[PDB]
Design an enzyme around this catalytic site. Structure first.
Site, mmCIF file in Angstrom:
data_model
loop_
_atom_site.group_PDB
_atom_site.id
_atom_site.type_symbol
_atom_site.label_atom_id
_atom_site.label_comp_id
_atom_site.label_asym_id
_atom_site.label_seq_id
_atom_site.Cartn_x
_atom_site.Cartn_y
_atom_site.Cartn_z
ATOM 1 C CB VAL B 50 -0.975 -0.032 1.174
ATOM 2 C CG1 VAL B 50 -0.323 0.525 2.435
ATOM 3 C CG2 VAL B 50 -2.282 0.613 0.795
ATOM 4 C CE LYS B 82 2.640 14.335 -1.777
ATOM 5 N NZ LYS B 82 3.329 13.614 -0.680
ATOM 6 N N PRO B 99 2.280 22.840 -0.700
ATOM 7 C CG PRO B 99 3.150 24.869 -1.517
ATOM 8 C CD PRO B 99 2.272 24.298 -0.409
HETATM 9 C C1 LIG Z 1 -2.244 2.094 5.054
HETATM 10 C C2 LIG Z 1 -0.838 2.523 4.751
HETATM 11 C C3 LIG Z 1 -0.540 3.520 3.840
HETATM 12 C C4 LIG Z 1 0.775 3.874 3.566
HETATM 13 N N1 LIG Z 1 1.024 4.880 2.693
HETATM 14 C C5 LIG Z 1 2.288 5.278 2.377
HETATM 15 C C6 LIG Z 1 2.584 6.393 1.416
HETATM 16 O O1 LIG Z 1 1.696 7.038 0.777
HETATM 17 N N2 LIG Z 1 3.876 6.735 1.239
HETATM 18 C C7 LIG Z 1 4.905 6.125 1.887
HETATM 19 O O2 LIG Z 1 6.091 6.515 1.633
HETATM 20 N N3 LIG Z 1 4.683 5.103 2.780
HETATM 21 C C8 LIG Z 1 3.448 4.633 3.065
HETATM 22 N N4 LIG Z 1 3.259 3.563 3.998
HETATM 23 C C9 LIG Z 1 4.490 2.900 4.529
HETATM 24 C C10 LIG Z 1 4.987 2.027 3.279
HETATM 25 O O3 LIG Z 1 3.811 1.298 2.949
HETATM 26 C C11 LIG Z 1 5.895 0.750 3.169
HETATM 27 O O4 LIG Z 1 5.875 -0.108 1.967
HETATM 28 C C12 LIG Z 1 5.261 -0.339 3.985
HETATM 29 O O5 LIG Z 1 4.113 0.168 4.731
HETATM 30 C C13 LIG Z 1 6.416 -1.008 4.730
HETATM 31 O O6 LIG Z 1 7.204 -1.749 3.845
HETATM 32 P P1 LIG Z 1 8.004 -2.981 4.566
HETATM 33 O O7 LIG Z 1 8.929 -3.433 3.443
HETATM 34 O O8 LIG Z 1 8.614 -2.518 5.819
HETATM 35 O O9 LIG Z 1 7.027 -4.111 5.064
HETATM 36 P P2 LIG Z 1 6.126 -5.166 4.196
HETATM 37 O O10 LIG Z 1 5.696 -4.528 2.875
HETATM 38 O O11 LIG Z 1 5.115 -5.573 5.286
HETATM 39 O O12 LIG Z 1 7.132 -6.386 3.902
HETATM 40 C C14 LIG Z 1 7.506 -7.382 4.833
HETATM 41 C C15 LIG Z 1 8.284 -8.440 4.072
HETATM 42 O O13 LIG Z 1 8.793 -9.238 5.145
HETATM 43 C C16 LIG Z 1 8.636 -10.614 4.784
HETATM 44 N N5 LIG Z 1 8.552 -11.483 5.982
HETATM 45 C C17 LIG Z 1 7.802 -11.261 7.103
HETATM 46 N N6 LIG Z 1 8.008 -12.274 7.990
HETATM 47 C C18 LIG Z 1 8.871 -13.143 7.408
HETATM 48 C C19 LIG Z 1 9.434 -14.433 7.788
HETATM 49 N N7 LIG Z 1 9.121 -14.976 9.002
HETATM 50 N N8 LIG Z 1 10.281 -15.001 6.942
HETATM 51 C C20 LIG Z 1 10.620 -14.458 5.756
HETATM 52 N N9 LIG Z 1 10.115 -13.295 5.345
HETATM 53 C C21 LIG Z 1 9.250 -12.620 6.125
HETATM 54 C C22 LIG Z 1 7.345 -10.662 3.966
HETATM 55 O O14 LIG Z 1 7.200 -11.917 3.186
HETATM 56 C C23 LIG Z 1 7.500 -9.383 3.137
HETATM 57 O O15 LIG Z 1 8.243 -9.683 1.850
HETATM 58 C C24 LIG Z 1 1.899 3.176 4.259
HETATM 59 C C25 LIG Z 1 1.556 2.143 5.134
HETATM 60 C C26 LIG Z 1 0.245 1.786 5.398
HETATM 61 C C27 LIG Z 1 -0.098 0.686 6.382
#
Ligand SMILES: Cc1cc2nc3c(=O)[nH]c(=O)nc-3n(C[C@H](O)[C@H](O)[C@H](O)COP(=O)(O)OP(=O)(O)OC[C@H]3O[C@@H](n4cnc5c(N)ncnc54)[C@H](O)[C@@H]3O)c2cc1C
Ligand SMILES: [Cl-]
Lengths: 514, 519
Positions: B50, B82, B99
């Site tokens: 997301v 943006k 902005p």
């Molecule tokens: C509702 C919402 C809106 C958002 N909007 C924005 C926005 O507009 N702009 C912005 O910059 N950010 C935004 N964020 C933050 C941004 O989304 C990041 O992509 C994300 O939320 C975090 O990315 P991540 O890689 O940390 O985690 P995730 O995308 O949750 O990835 C976790 C990874 O860990 C792996 N994993 C977990 N456990 C294990 C295990 N035991 N073994 C092996 N692999 C594992 C999974 O398979 C996955 O590949 C938003 C977040 C949310 C919730």
């Protein structure tokens, strides 16, 4: 209405007078009174300062530089010479850093020390100043190379008092016997020993260590820096210098502390800052006399290192020793007065009903002072010069916890000023403002704290050519005494320092901070 | 990185494959190409799915720090632009716009307020946003773009972004491991010895990056680093997402719309508007939130429900583990700080990773820097909630009465006595600065507070009103003549030198020379 229209500055030191002058200079509609006791003397010591102070005095308070020189008779400070650490010759810690940089890693690789890192460092080791008799008249590079003053305290205070009278500060001779509150965080008035009742819309506590309004009346507690900073007294005196004026403050390692030497035109002014716990004041005096044969013995002054929890509460703010103090190892006293005054003059409300910005002032000052504390802590922790019980305790037990994360960063790759931009930027937040990453690096490298030195990135012969142009400018500089006579003979030399677009202390740069 | 050293850090295991994991793996391999870098991810735990809007810095990070070619990026990710955030927020019926171009685009905040009653003529980008236009112009036999002068960011479809980053990592020699980690096995204090997969493989690396998302398997669960909630300030915990057709009309901004129990984003992609209603599940059931969203945005689909928590861990780095992304910290995407903070954590790791297990470990510096940056973002978001007078619902009454703003309250007291803070004297600005977030700055705090009509003494203007007016009219001129976004994106796809001038030109906000300085 409830407009804040009168301010009583309580106490007349450098803190009191700097404060009253700023309030008048920037808010000239205020009625500003300075209240002091002719029978309780002002503390009597803070005589060296930092480059920023030159701009504060001249730009912010609009003090004419020709008249300042004639009345105060300052000498110049290019930095501090540290007889400090395990290098037999110690090291110098200059003010210049951009416009004067020759190169720190080059100094260390060429020379085994930091004493050729900069043009001012080389001027210091020569006892010379970057002023030159150039057929024509004089030619000064002072406008390019930031410097500070040493100022005789009595003279500085006299002059500021003359200035206050000119600018319409009212003076009140009186000893405060009681501070009366009329509500929780609100001073209602001051009762003098002779029965007068003084009332102002706002009070500035410049009553020194006693902190009569802030600590004693409003109950703001003191926070000790004693886990990092163990000294608590100083024996001061003077020593003849034969007319030879060292262009720096000296900080000399002693058995139970360290001794400052601050040159004035008449003589060198000394202070052995020591721990009472480690030695008797008389013994400290005897050690001073032995180390510095001929020095007089003039006074014993006691202090404590630390700050109050708050500087500003209600209708009171404290400026100077009534708020906080650290030993003068980095000449931060006047700097922190000036910072506090700028905070007050900027933030003082128009009226009693307005939103009071005391929390912001408190946080700002706590942050500044606490960073100075941790910077000082590393002067103590790493000083390998002597192996007395004091210095063994200081190397084993000095609390450095607030700067330890930056030390680990330095350990991995020094100088911090030679790191990639992002790391430098990150390290910057642990370093004191003003003293900077460059001051932390100088102290750590000067004391030979173990670190992985960074690669020069630039070939040797290059640094070497910068080094020679610098050394040649340095040894051709005048001796200080001649240079000061030139400044007195030509008032237009100070005036260029302040006007110039390319001066470090020019109108341009001034505006960009105050 | 020496050849002798049996203590050298030679292999890094990045645990997790969302945007945090791929950006970290690409950064490690770009800047330390001698490392063997492996990315481990579970096909059975999906990425969060997301985060699509960013800030202006991210443009430099992608292209300069990670060396991503812009023509290729545009081709594979298909970004939109943006210029800021449109806030349907506070008590002004028209809302206000925020902005990115304070500075080169400045017209003047005080003059905008005195002459217009709002902040929407405070800069050129503010006027481009209200015109729904972009600062690109058909020139004689070409296009003239002022994008290089005015900071802007991307909106990026998450599935395309991830696929592209995944492809880039493979092309650049990042090794992929498909595994579900079952146990993180320590072999001493603060030291991960290895990972055991659910099928029984044992994975071992010299250093681990925790990119496991909210579960925070290494940092929180194995190392026991506790969580510090931001819930006193930030009460939402869920989002319902969906898409809405836009006719091919691409708004040059993210929209933030006040809703009964939270707020809803609108992030344009070329194919449709991507929406999300961020809400407090304590205040509204998810099905009722989805129903409200369809009332407010008729036609919107209902795709996913995502849950989250706002807060950070005490530390990001401990021993041979650093956490990046949601494993460390998260705030709701009201200012799209997620990717920014990922990028910041990555730069920290990449700069500070030791060469060997003997070297000094600078994990306290990293932890303090990250805590301070996240905490400042928290307090900035807190004032988006405390002062939103738009709606009279129980959620919004509670927000206006109980949102913890303690950490920015001293700055609010300064504001009140004379707004905007960016109009104060230089000393006061420098003091105020310390409470504002580094990227968003005092200008961001001023815009949110004046946009929301928070009472303050308005400062007098520093120039005659006719001078502001002249500069505004020049700006309005430029803003009204800009292309629609969709035509301008077609120009950038057709001519790679538009992006090349953005990234190379010494005059550009995103040029080489600024990049060198920012590290
Ligand atoms: C509702 C919402 C809106 C958002 N909007 C924005 C926005 O507009 N702009 C912005 O910059 N950010 C935004 N964020 C933050 C941004 O989304 C990041 O992509 C994300 O939320 C975090 O990315 P991540 O890689 O940390 O985690 P995730 O995308 O949750 O990835 C976790 C990874 O860990 C792996 N994993 C977990 N456990 C294990 C295990 N035991 N073994 C092996 N692999 C594992 C999974 O398979 C996955 O590949 C938003 C977040 C949310 C919730
Ligand atoms: Cl976000």
């Amino acid at each position: 209405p409830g407009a804040i229209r009168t301010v009583g500055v309580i106490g007349g030191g450098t803190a009191g007078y700097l404060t009253a002058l700023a309030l008048k200079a920037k808010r000239p509609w205020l009625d500003v009174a300075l209240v002091e006791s002719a029978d309780i003397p002002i503390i009597g010591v803070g005589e060296a300062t930092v480059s920023y102070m030159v701009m504060f005095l001249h730009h912010y308070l609009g003090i004419d530089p020709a008249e300042f020189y004639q009345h105060v008779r300052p000498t110049w400070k290019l930095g501090i010479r540290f007889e400090w650490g395990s290098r037999p010759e110690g090291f110098v810690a200059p003010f210049d850093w951009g416009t004067g940089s020759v190169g720190l890693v080059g100094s260390l690789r060429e020379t085994g020390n930091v004493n050729e890192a900069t043009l001012q460092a080389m001027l210091m080791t020569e006892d010379r100043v970057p002023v030159y008799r150039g057929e024509g008249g004089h030619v000064s590079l002072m406008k390019y190379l930031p410097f500070a003053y040493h100022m005789d305290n009595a003279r500085l205070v006299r002059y500021l008092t003359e200035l206050a009278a000119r600018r319409g500060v009212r003076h009140v001779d009186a000893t405060v016997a009681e501070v009366r509150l009329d509500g929780p965080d609100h001073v209602g008035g001051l009762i003098t020993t002779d029965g007068r009742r003084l009332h102002y819309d706002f009070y500035v506590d410049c009553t020194g260590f006693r902190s009569l309004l802030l600590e004693k009346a409003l109950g703001i507690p003191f926070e000790s820096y004693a886990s990092s900073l163990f000294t608590d007294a100083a024996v001061t005196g003077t020593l003849a210098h034969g007319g030879h004026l060292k262009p720096y403050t000296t900080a000399t390692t002693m058995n139970a502390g360290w001794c400052w030497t601050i040159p004035t035109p008449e003589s060198d002014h000394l202070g052995y800052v020591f721990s009472s716990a480690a030695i008797d004041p008389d013994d400290a005096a005897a050690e001073m006399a032995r180390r510095f044969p001929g020095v007089t013995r003039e006074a014993l002054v006691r202090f404590r290192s630390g700050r109050h929890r708050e500087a500003w509460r209600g209708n009171v703010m404290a400026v100077g020793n009534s708020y906080a103090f650290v030993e003068p190892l980095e000449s931060s006293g006047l700097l922190m007065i000036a910072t506090a005054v700028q905070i007050l003059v900027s933030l003082l409300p128009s009226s009693r009903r307005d939103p009071l910005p005391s929390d912001a002032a408190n946080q700002a000052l706590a942050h500044r002072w606490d960073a100075i504390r941790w910077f000082l802590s590393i002067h103590y922790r790493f000083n390998g010069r002597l192996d007395t019980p004091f210095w063994k305790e200081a190397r084993a037990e000095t609390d450095i916890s607030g700067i330890e994360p930056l030390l680990r960063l330095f350990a991995a790759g020094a100088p911090l000023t030679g790191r990639d931009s992002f790391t430098r930027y990150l390290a910057d937040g642990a370093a004191p403002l003003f003293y900077g990453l460059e001051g932390v690096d100088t102290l750590l490298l000067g004391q030979e704290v173990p670190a992985r030195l960074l690669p020069p990135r630039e070939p040797p012969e290059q640094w070497r050519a910068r080094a020679a142009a610098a050394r040649s400018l340095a040894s051709r500089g005048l001796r200080q005494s001649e240079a000061l006579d030139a400044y007195a003979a030509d008032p237009c030399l100070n005036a260029e320092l302040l006007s110039d677009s390319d001066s470090w202390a020019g109108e341009r740069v001034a505006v960009r901070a105050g």
